[PDB]
């Protein structure tokens, strides 16, 4: 596929070198038979030690040169293929990160990782295992072709004639084969997703004692994959049998012509024709196999060129931001489940230096408001304005530097406490991370850790208590000094004393604060209170 | 190498038939118009049919072997202890289970047939050479083992290199999985570039290893070709000198070298196989370590009593996590849960409450003291029985990517009727919003449960716990995301439901207003119990609990 060759373009010098080495290997292999014939002839009668040593010497010399060239060729092709694999992985993963957040609910993470792991190998692995033997036999096959052409040109033309059903059978086989490969990859992805879900949430599984059920599910997926593999293998074997039968038909056609026809040479001409035909059929089969393998990986190419459902990027990066946020008749419905509105005609204004509290029952749409503020989703009606300009017109890094949120259930990453505080900062000094840890009251438990600020926080923060993880999320928010701060239930896991101590969110009076909570304790001190019920302001 | 061949013991009855077919085909290959035309057609048809049958049998057997191996590896993975999954992260385990086994199976299927075919053909050629001449073929057999010395010396290289390649691939897979999950957090901090840089840093190691693999492949190709050339030329030379002395014949030597040509070709192929076998041995090290690992946790018991009270006794329980055994998280806990009563466990963050909840679920074993359910240790009960009698909600509940009907009924052996699921949803308070969904209880949720709100997810998690009718119920901060109205459901479930007499409840929360009606209150700080008693008793003490309540 021409797209994949364009992707392979940086590897061109290696392919050129490999082609040169292949040419040298063929040219060297042309000479070994000559001197081997002299060795055989001198051994078989008319013995002469002077010629014998010379013939053996040249045989050894050209075998040695051909061996070295072949080894270099093989190394070059292997390295080129591996580099192409790694480039495919890099570009696919880079493309996935760009996508809109709806994409990751339509797809599943285990399937995406299965794509990255598996589908790239199909498109990368163009070459069979035994290709070196196939190449080394080329000169012998050409020599056999020379014999049968001179012995009987007529029957050679009859051999060159293609079989009546050879073309259709190959097309049908390729069309079926590509579809079977695609189905196999889909089944593999589903099994990978099953394993991903089983392993990721294992503590719940063991709490309910449902390991055997997961094992049964995985075994069922494996059975489906096995059935697909068996179907592919059986179809390939049947195609090979049919191709051999067609070759046999062509064979006696010319056997008939040869018997019609120069005496005693039919015993030797048949062998050469059979060998040459087998070699050419194998070459055509390899070409078709490579074509089908590239064709089966179409979903990787699909993910590598999907344009996300996002507005064009934003130029704006002001030197100073006033931090006034305005909602103007905002209506929203999630892209995966439209026609079911969540927010209906919201309109409110947040001003710097004042604390706003948003309250409402479960499912009212408070986290939806928090997500619209951060430009994670686009409103389906109205506008969201920051400093009297649309939120989507600001630069990505600048916007998510000025506007910062603490999520409902904070997610941390495997790595140090220094890397979870100061996540996404290009550079952040020891002093700012300690000041942010002190501001969030996180520093008390950080000293008791074995390696302080350098201690490994486990995967998803699984090696911390809930309140500790919550405080590290608060410190991750505060280390940036945001102009607009959003707190989506930031004190749910904290004890009453730590919750009380953290109430003074904007004592300096220089930033906009939005507080989302259920408890009335954190909403009594707010300047403005907004009540949200069924997606409408009350 | 015997470890790889150990898994093939269940397919001997078929691989022997495949071997018989291949040897028959090899022997057949080695050994008026109407009369001449029919024989060739019959011979070709016989050869094609034999090849077709052999390939079919071999492919079916290899597919069965692959499926069985993958299933066994996953089953062995799921048996490990709880702390095994903190040392190994999700992406690493997934890559080991789903990718190493496939590579091993592919290598085995690609190499076994080639080995058997060329071995049989080499044996046939060796027999023909034995017929041609005895001395020269004996010389060939003498010099043949010298060619395998270089592969034997080098082989450990391929194992050590392939192990590193697999490790780097697993690390890259872990990075990719951890980045692709929790995408809103990456997006909201504009950190896509950091994740891409991490992934590229993992790709660089694989690139560095691939360079070495390519160089080793080229060197091995050189060595194999030179070994074949030397083996051929040595015999050719000794024969060309022996013929001059007249002790042999010209035609016999010509035939012998003509067959020696093909014997050396087969020898070259068999030499080519060995490094691939070493690579395969190297690639399967981790999965076989998984298979042969001994779990560091007591196995399941046998007891499944018909009558169980739900009486839980802690007797001087202390615990320290295996990844940091030097620090004790709990110190000498001693309390009893009795049916028909609610016991509240309160204290600052990081005090160990969730650790107590995890111990009570038999996820970890105490380092000291005893933990008894109705007078007998937890490991004496059968697994699926014990985890029906004891159920918990969890501090940040996790749901799976299935329908709401399956999420509530998760883990049960026999499927409950829709009437029971509706009752559980009503008791947990989740029935109000489920009925509003267009598909009702058949609504599919995403793998992270992100399509639900926090309170809705928590209500589903509570319904999942109630449907089992447990005798011991653990509410680990189950009221965190519930709004004002939904807290009344939990209050009625705890203190007013008519089923409260059949079970004992352990209530863990930071919402101390829910604790006032508890029969017993335990104050846990620093991993040790400081105060205990009812609400009024602790209020009259003016101690830690009173100070915590009077904090505002
Ligand atoms: N990714 C999604 N796709 C579809 N619907 C969604 C998605 N995320 C949330 N919803 C739905 O949108 C509605 C609003 O949810 P949201 O989390 O904004 O409410 P909330 O008031 O913050 O809830 P809570 O108080 O429980 O945190 C709910 O009905 C929820 O199920
Ligand atoms: N996997 C782990 N390995 C090591 N230490 C851990 C692990 N999980 C938790 N801890 C530590 O054990 C202690 C108790 O944590 P735990 O979650 O049980 O406390 P908690 O009282 O429930 O806290 P919270 O009120 O915040 O939920 C803490 O110091 C915590 O960091
Ligand atoms: Mg919310
Ligand atoms: Mg806890």
CB atoms A39 and B217 under 8 Å: no
Q: Which residues contact A466 (CB under 8 A, 6 or more apart)?
A: A493, B349, B354, B395, B396, B477
Please tell me the distance between residue A464's alpha carbon and the centre of ligand 4 in angstroms: 9
Q: Which residues contact B496 (CB under 8 A, 6 or more apart)?
A: none
Gap from B6 CA to chain A (nearest CA, Å): 21
Angle A302-A306-A309 from CA coordinates, rounded to 5°: 150
Q: Which two tokens mark B191?
A: 């950190």
Three-state secondary structure call for residue B377: strand
Cα distance between residue B203 and residue B208, in whole Å: 9
Are A199 and A59 members of one domain? no
The number of CA neighbours under 13 Å toward the Cβ of B295 is 15
User: Pick from A93, A98, A148: which is nearest to A116 by CA?
Assistant: A93
Please tell me the distance between residue A534's alpha carbon and the centre of ligand 1 in angstroms: 11
Q: Tokens 């393998």 identify what position?
A: A293
What angle do helix axes A32-43 and A49-97 make, rounded to 10 degrees?
150
Three-state secondary structure call for residue A5: helix
| A517 within 8 A of A524, measured Cβ to Cβ | no
**Exposed e or buried b per residue across B515-550, where buried means at least 16 C-beta atoms within 10 angstroms of its C-beta:** beebebbbbbbebebebbeebeebeeeeebbeebbe
Cα distance between residue B5 and residue B344, in whole Å: 57
How big is chain B by its Cα radius of gyration, in Å?
35
Q: Which residues contact B323 (CB under 8 A, 6 or more apart)?
A: A463, B83, B86, B87
Burial degree of B400 (CB within 10 A; 0-12, 13-18, 19+): buried
How big is chain A by its Cα radius of gyration, in Å?
36
Domain edge (last residue) among A278, A310, A342: A310
> Measured in whole angstroms, how far is the alpha carbon of residue B347 from the centre of its chain?
38
| B494 within 8 A of B342, measured Cβ to Cβ | yes
Q: How far is residue A207 from each of residues A211, B88, B352, B383, B385, measured CA to CA in Å?
A: 10, 20, 18, 10, 12
Q: How many CB atoms lie within 10 A of CB B458?
A: 27
Cα distance between residue A100 and residue A89, in whole Å: 20
> Is A156 inside any structural domain?
yes
Cα distance between residue A298 and residue A123, in whole Å: 9
**In chain B, which residues have their Cβ closer than 8 Å to the Cβ of A233?**
55-56, 59-60, 63
Domain edge (last residue) among A252, A285, A310: A310
| A488 within 8 A of A367, measured Cβ to Cβ | yes
> Is A464 inside any structural domain?
yes
| A100 within 8 A of A310, measured Cβ to Cβ | yes
Q: Tokens 């408070």 identify what position?
A: A366
Cα distance between residue B177 and residue B171, in whole Å: 10
H-run or E-run covering A348: strand A343-350
The number of CA neighbours under 13 Å toward the Cβ of B355 is 26
| A458 within 8 A of B223, measured Cβ to Cβ | no
Q: How many CB atoms lie within 10 A of CB B276?
A: 17
Q: Which two tokens mark B176?
A: 């990719």
> Is A82 inside any structural domain?
yes
Burial degree of B10 (CB within 10 A; 0-12, 13-18, 19+): exposed
| B458 within 8 A of B482, measured Cβ to Cβ | yes
> B312-399+464-549 belongs to which CATH class?
alpha beta
Q: Tokens 């006794």 identify what position?
A: B313
| B92 within 8 A of B171, measured Cβ to Cβ | yes
> Is A320 inside any structural domain?
no
Burial degree of A264 (CB within 10 A; 0-12, 13-18, 19+): exposed
Cα distance between residue A456 and residue A467, in whole Å: 17
Cα distance between residue A137 and residue A131, in whole Å: 10
Which residue in B324, B347, B454 is closest to A408 by CB distance?
B454
Q: Which two tokens mark B33?
A: 């118009």
**In chain A, which residues have their Cβ closer than 8 Å to the Cβ of B396?**
409, 466
Which residue in A96, A117, A222 is closest to B67 by CB distance?
A222
> Is A317 inside any structural domain?
no
Cα distance between residue A357 and residue A518, in whole Å: 10
Return the residue whose CA atom lies nearest to atom 25 of ligand 1.
A362
- Long-range own/partner contacts, residues B13-18 (CB < 8 A, 24 or more apart): B14/B57, B14/B60, B14/B61, B15/B58, B15/B61, B17/B57, B18/B54, B18/B57, B18/B58, B18/B61
Cα distance between residue A393 and residue A389, in whole Å: 7
Cα distance between residue A209 and residue A213, in whole Å: 9
The 3-class SS string of B79-135 reads CCCCCHHHHCCHHHHHHHHHHHHHHHHHHHHHHHHHHHHHHHHHHHHHHHHHHHCCH
Q: Which residues contact A102 (CB under 8 A, 6 or more apart)?
A: A309, A334, A335, A336
User: Pick from A33, A121, A198: which is nearest to B77 by CA?
Assistant: A198
- A325-332 vs A381-386, strand pairing mode: antiparallel
Q: Which residues pair with A409 in a beta bridge?
A: none
Q: Which two tokens mark B322?
A: 């295996």
Three-state secondary structure call for residue B226: helix
B336 φ/ψ angles, rounded to the nearest 5 degrees = -130, 135
User: Pick from A375, A97, A302: which is nearest to B183 by CA?
Assistant: A97
Q: Which residues contact B334 (CB under 8 A, 6 or more apart)?
A: B314, B315, B316, B317, B529
Q: How many CB atoms lie within 10 A of CB A221?
A: 22
Q: How many helical (H) and strand (E) elements, i.e. helices and strands, does chain B have?
A: 22, 11
Are A77 and A134 members of one domain? no
Q: Which two tokens mark B25?
A: 């085909």
Cα distance between residue B90 and residue B95, in whole Å: 9
Q: Which two tokens mark B221?
A: 């190709």
Q: Which two tokens mark B494?
A: 């705890």
Are A231 and A354 members of one domain? no
| A85 within 8 A of A124, measured Cβ to Cβ | yes
Q: Tokens 């931090």 identify what position?
A: A323
Cα distance between residue A347 and residue B215, in whole Å: 67
Are A332 and A246 members of one domain? no
Cα distance between residue B73 and residue A236, in whole Å: 29
Q: Given 3-state DSSP classes, what are the helix, strand and coil percentages for chain B, each rounded to the nearest 5? A: 65, 10, 25
Are A123 and A71 members of one domain? no
| B347 within 8 A of B524, measured Cβ to Cβ | yes
DSSP letters along A295-345, please?
HHTHHHHHHHHPPPS-PPP--B--SS----EEEEEEEE--TTSTTS-SEEE
> Is A318 inside any structural domain?
no
Are A230 and A109 members of one domain? yes
Are A302 and A384 members of one domain? no
H-run or E-run covering B354: helix B353-360
Domain edge (last residue) among A97, A117, A136: A97
Measured from the Cα of B483, ligand 1's closest atom is 25
Interchain CB contact of B444 with A (< 8 Å): no
Three-state secondary structure call for residue A498: helix
- What range does the domain containing A513 cover? 325-537
H-run or E-run covering B331: strand B330-333
| B472 within 8 A of B385, measured Cβ to Cβ | no
User: Pick from B321, B487, B515, B477: which is nearest to B396 by CA?
Assistant: B477
Cα distance between residue A172 and residue A509, in whole Å: 74
What angle do helix axes B418-428 and B484-495 make, rounded to 10 degrees?
110
User: Structurally, how many domains does chain A consist of?
Assistant: 3
- A512-516 vs A528-533, strand pairing mode: unpaired
Spell out which residues line ligand 2, taking CB within 6 angstroms: A 463-468, 493; B 86, 321, 323-324, 329, 349-355, 395
Are A112 and A91 members of one domain? no
User: Pick from A140, A41, A56, A62: which is nearest to B253 by CA?
Assistant: A41
Q: How many CB atoms lie within 10 A of CB A100?
A: 17
Cα distance between residue B545 and residue B529, in whole Å: 12
Q: Which two tokens mark B328?
A: 């004790």
Cα distance between residue A333 and residue A342, in whole Å: 5
| A86 within 8 A of A11, measured Cβ to Cβ | no
Longest dimension (CA), chain A: 116
Are A376 and A467 members of one domain? yes
Q: Which residues contact B120 (CB under 8 A, 6 or more apart)?
A: B22, B23, B26
Q: How far is residue A244 from each of residues A141, A171, A239, A251, A289, measured CA to CA in Å?
A: 19, 16, 9, 10, 18
Which residue in A42, A47, A67 is closest to B225 by CB distance?
A67
H-run or E-run covering B522: strand B520-525
Are A430 and A475 members of one domain? yes
- B342-346 vs B504-508, strand pairing mode: parallel
Q: Provide the Cα torsion B453, B457, B460, B465; round to 10°.
A: -160
Q: Where does chain B hold its CATH 1.20.1560.10 domain(s)?
A: 13-292
CB atoms B218 and A63 under 8 Å: no
Q: In what order do the strands lie in the sheet with A403-406?
A: A403-406, A484-488, A512-516, A355-359, A528-533, A536-537
Gap from A67 CA to chain B (nearest CA, Å): 6
Q: Which residues contact A401 (CB under 8 A, 6 or more apart)?
A: A480, A482, B190
Q: Which two tokens mark B39?
A: 């024989």
Q: How many residues does chain A have?
A: 538
| DSSP classification of residue B351 | S
Q: Tokens 């292949």 identify what position?
A: A22
Are A24 and A130 members of one domain? no
Return the residue whose CA atom lies nearest to atom 17 of ligand 2.
A465
Cα distance between residue B352 and residue B319, in whole Å: 10
| A419 within 8 A of B190, measured Cβ to Cβ | no
Cα distance between residue B350 and residue B527, in whole Å: 9
User: Pick from B25, B63, B49, B64: which is nearest to A233 by CA?
Assistant: B63
Three-state secondary structure call for residue B530: strand
Query: Which CATH fold topology does B13-292 show?
Result: ABC transporter transmembrane region fold (1.20.1560)
Q: Which two tokens mark A20?
A: 């040169």
Three-state secondary structure call for residue B462: helix
| Ramachandran sector of residue B100 (left: φ over 0; alpha: ψ -120 to 50; beta: rest) | alpha
Are A272 and A185 members of one domain? yes
**In chain B, which residues have their Cβ closer than 8 Å to the Cβ of A132?**
221
> Is A364 inside any structural domain?
yes
Angle B272-B275-B280 from CA coordinates, rounded to 5°: 125
Q: Which residues pair with B302 in a beta bridge?
A: none
Q: Which two tokens mark A517?
A: 């909570």
Burial degree of B121 (CB within 10 A; 0-12, 13-18, 19+): buried
Cα distance between residue A479 and residue B328, in whole Å: 32
Cα distance between residue A403 and residue A241, in whole Å: 67
| B342 within 8 A of B497, measured Cβ to Cβ | no
The 3-class SS string of A382-430 reads EEEEECCEEHHHECHHHHHHHEEEECCCCCCCCEEHHHHCCCCCCCCCH
B450 is in an annotated binding site: yes
CATH code where residue A503 lies: 3.40.50.300
Cα distance between residue A484 and residue A475, in whole Å: 15
Q: Which residues contact A384 (CB under 8 A, 6 or more apart)?
A: A325, A326, A327, A328, A330, A372, A373, A375, A390, A391, A392
The number of CA neighbours under 13 Å toward the Cβ of B221 is 25
Interchain CB contact of B154 with A (< 8 Å): no
A416 φ/ψ angles, rounded to the nearest 5 degrees = -70, 170
**In chain B, which residues have their Cβ closer than 8 Å to the Cβ of A336?**
451
User: Pick from A82, A84, A80: which is nearest to A72 by CA?
Assistant: A80
Cα distance between residue A459 and residue A456, in whole Å: 9
Longest dimension (CA), chain B: 121
- A415-416 vs A512-516, strand pairing mode: unpaired
The number of CA neighbours under 13 Å toward the Cβ of B44 is 18
CA-based nearest residue in chain A for residue B194: A424
Cα distance between residue B428 and residue A454, in whole Å: 42
Q: How many residues does chain B have?
A: 552
Q: Which two tokens mark B13?
A: 């009855």
How was this model experimentally determined? cryo-EM
CB contacts under 8 A, A 17-36 vs B, are none
Q: Which residues contact B272 (CB under 8 A, 6 or more apart)?
A: B224
CB atoms B176 and A116 under 8 Å: yes
Q: Where does chain B hold its CATH 3.40.50.300 domain(s)?
A: 312-399+464-549
Cα distance between residue A336 and residue A230, in whole Å: 37
What angle do helix axes A166-200 and B33-78 make, rounded to 10 degrees?
10
Interchain CB contact of B485 with A (< 8 Å): yes
| B378 within 8 A of B300, measured Cβ to Cβ | no
| A528 within 8 A of A354, measured Cβ to Cβ | yes
Cα distance between residue B70 and residue B97, in whole Å: 7
Burial degree of A155 (CB within 10 A; 0-12, 13-18, 19+): buried
Return the residue whose CA atom lies nearest to atom 27 of ligand 1.
B454
> Is A240 inside any structural domain?
yes
Q: Which two tokens mark A405?
A: 């949120």
| B350 within 8 A of B277, measured Cβ to Cβ | no
Please tell me the distance between residue A335's alpha carbon and the centre of ligand 2 in angstroms: 38
| A406 within 8 A of A474, measured Cβ to Cβ | yes
């Amino acid at each position: 596929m021409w797209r994949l060759l364009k992707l392979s373009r940086p590897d061109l010098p290696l392919l050129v070198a490999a082609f040169f080495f292949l040419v040298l290997a063929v040219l060297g292999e042309t000479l070994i038979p000559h001197y081997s014939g002299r060795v055989i002839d001198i051994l078989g009668g008319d013995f002469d030690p002077h010629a014998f040593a010379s013939a053996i010497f040249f045989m050894c010399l050209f075998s040695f040169g051909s061996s070295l060239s072949a080894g270099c060729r093989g190394g070059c092709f292997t390295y080129t293929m591996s580099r192409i694999n790694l480039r495919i992985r890099e570009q696919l993963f880079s493309s996935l990160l760009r996508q809109d957040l709806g994409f990751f609910q339509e797809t599943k993470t285990g399937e995406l990782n299965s794509r990255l792991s598996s589908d790239t190998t199909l498109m990368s692995n163009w070459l069979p295992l035994n290709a070196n033997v196939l190449l080394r036999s080329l000169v012998k096959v050409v020599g056999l072709y020379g014999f049968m052409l001179s012995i009987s040109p007529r029957l050679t033309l009859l051999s060159l004639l293609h079989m009546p059903f050879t073309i259709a059978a190959e097309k049908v086989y390729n069309t079926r084969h590509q579809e079977v490969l695609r189905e196999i990859q889909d089944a593999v992805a589903r099994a990978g997703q099953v394993v991903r879900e089983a392993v990721g949430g294992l503590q719940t599984v063991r709490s309910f004692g449902a390991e055997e059920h997961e094992v049964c599910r995985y075994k069922e997926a494996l059975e489906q994959c096995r059935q697909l593999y068996w179907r592919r293998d059986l179809e390939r074997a049947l195609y090979l049998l049919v191709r051999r039968v067609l070759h046999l038909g062509v064979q006696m056609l010319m056997l008939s012509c040869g018997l019609q026809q120069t005496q005693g040479s039919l015993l030797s001409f048949m062998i050469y024709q059979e060998s040459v035909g087998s070699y050419v059929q194998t070459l055509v089969y390899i070409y078709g196999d490579m074509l089908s393998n590239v064709g089966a990986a179409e979903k990787v190419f699909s993910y590598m060129d999907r344009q996300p459902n996002l507005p064009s990027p934003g130029t704006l990066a002001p030197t100073t931001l006033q931090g006034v946020v305005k909602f103007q008749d905002v209506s929203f419905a999630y892209p995966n489940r439209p026609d079911r509105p969540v927010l209906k005609g919201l309109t409110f204004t947040l001003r710097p230096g004042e604390v706003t509290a948003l309250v409402g029952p479960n499912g009212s749409g408070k986290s939806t408001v928090a997500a619209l503020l951060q430009n994670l989703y686009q409103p389906t009606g109205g506008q969201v304005l920051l400093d009297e300009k649309p939120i989507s017109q600001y630069e990505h890094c600048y916007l998510h530097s000025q506007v910062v949120s603490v999520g409902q259930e904070p997610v941390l990453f495997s790595g140090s406490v220094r890397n979870n505080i100061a996540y996404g900062l290009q550079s952040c000094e020891d002093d700012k991370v300690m000041a942010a840890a002190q501001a969030a009251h996180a520093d008390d438990f950080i000293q008791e850790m074995e390696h302080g600020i350098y201690t490994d926080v486990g995967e998803k923060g699984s090696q911390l208590a809930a309140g500790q993880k919550q405080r590290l999320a608060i410190a991750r928010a505060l280390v940036r000094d945001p102009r607009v701060l959003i707190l989506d239930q930031a004190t749910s896991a904290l004890d009453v004393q730590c919750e009380q101590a953290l109430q003074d969110w904007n004592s300096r009076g220089d930033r906009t604060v939005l507080v989302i909570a259920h408890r009335l304790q954190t909403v009594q001190r707010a300047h403005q209170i907004l009540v949200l019920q069924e997606g409408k302001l009350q | 190498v015997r470890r790889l061949l150990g898994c093939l013991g269940s397919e001997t009855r078929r691989l022997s038939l495949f071997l018989v077919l291949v040897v028959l085909s090899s022997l057949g290959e080695m050994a008026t118009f109407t009369r001449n035309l029919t024989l060739m057609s019959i011979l070709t048809i016989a050869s094609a049919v034999l090849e077709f049958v052999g390939d079919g049998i071999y492919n079916n057997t290899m597919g069965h072997v692959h499926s069985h191996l993958q299933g066994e590896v996953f089953g062995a993975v799921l048996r490990q202890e709880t702390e095994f999954f903190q040392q190994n992260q999700t992406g690493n385990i997934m890559s080991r289970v789903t990718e190493d086994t496939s590579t091993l199976s592919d290598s085995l299927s690609e190499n076994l047939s080639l080995f058997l075919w060329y071995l049989v053909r080499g044996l046939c050629l060796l027999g023909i050479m034995l017929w041609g001449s005895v001395s020269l073929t004996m010389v060939t057999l003498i010099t043949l083992p010298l060619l395998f010395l270089l592969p034997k010396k080098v082989g450990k290289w391929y194992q050590l290199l392939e192990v590193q390649v697999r490790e780097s691939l697993a690390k890259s897979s872990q990075v990719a999985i951890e980045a692709l999950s929790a995408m809103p957090t990456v997006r909201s901090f504009a950190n896509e570039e950091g994740e891409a840089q991490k992934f590229r840093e993992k790709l660089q190691e694989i690139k560095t290893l691939n360079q070495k693999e390519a160089v080793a492949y080229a060197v091995n190709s050189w060595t194999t070709s030179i070994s074949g050339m030397l083996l051929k030329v040595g015999i050719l030379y000794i024969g060309g000198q022996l013929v001059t002395s007249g002790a042999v014949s010209s035609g016999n030597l010509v035939t012998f070298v003509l067959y020696q040509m093909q014997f050396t070709q087969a020898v070259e192929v068999l030499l080519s196989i060995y490094p691939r076998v070493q690579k395969a041995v190297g690639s399967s090290e981790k999965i076989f370590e998984y298979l042969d690992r001994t779990p560091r946790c007591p196995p399941s018991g046998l007891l499944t009593p018909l009558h169980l009270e739900g009486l839980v006794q802690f007797q001087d329980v202390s615990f320290a996590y295996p990844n940091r055994p030097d620090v004790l998280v709990l110190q000498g806990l001693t309390f009893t849960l009795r049916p028909g009563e609610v016991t509240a466990l309160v204290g600052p963050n990081g005090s160990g409450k969730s650790t107590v909840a995890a111990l009570l679920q038999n996820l970890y074993q105490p380092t000291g003291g005893q933990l008894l359910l109705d007078g007998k240790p937890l490991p004496q009960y059968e697994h699926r029985y014990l985890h029906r009698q004891v159920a918990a909600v969890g501090q940040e509940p996790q749901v799976f990517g299935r329908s709401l009907q399956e999420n509530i009924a998760y883990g049960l052996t026999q499927k409950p009727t829709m009437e029971e699921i509706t009752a559980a949803a009503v008791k947990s308070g989740a029935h109000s919003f489920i009925s509003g969904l267009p598909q009702g209880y058949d609504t599919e949720v995403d793998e992270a449960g992100s399509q639900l709100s926090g309170g809705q997810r928590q209500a589903v998690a509570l319904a999942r716990a109630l449907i089992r009718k447990p005798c011991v119920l653990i509410l680990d901060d189950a009221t965190s995301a519930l709004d004002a109205n939904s807290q009344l459901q939990v209050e009625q479930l705890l203190y007013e439901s008519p089923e409260r007499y059949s079970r004992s409840v352990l209530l863990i929360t930071q919402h101390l207003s829910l604790v006032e009606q508890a029969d017993h209150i335990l104050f846990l700080e620093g991993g040790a119990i400081r105060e205990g008693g009812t609400h009024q008793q602790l209020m009259e003490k003016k101690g830690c609990y009173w100070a915590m309540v009077q904090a505002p």
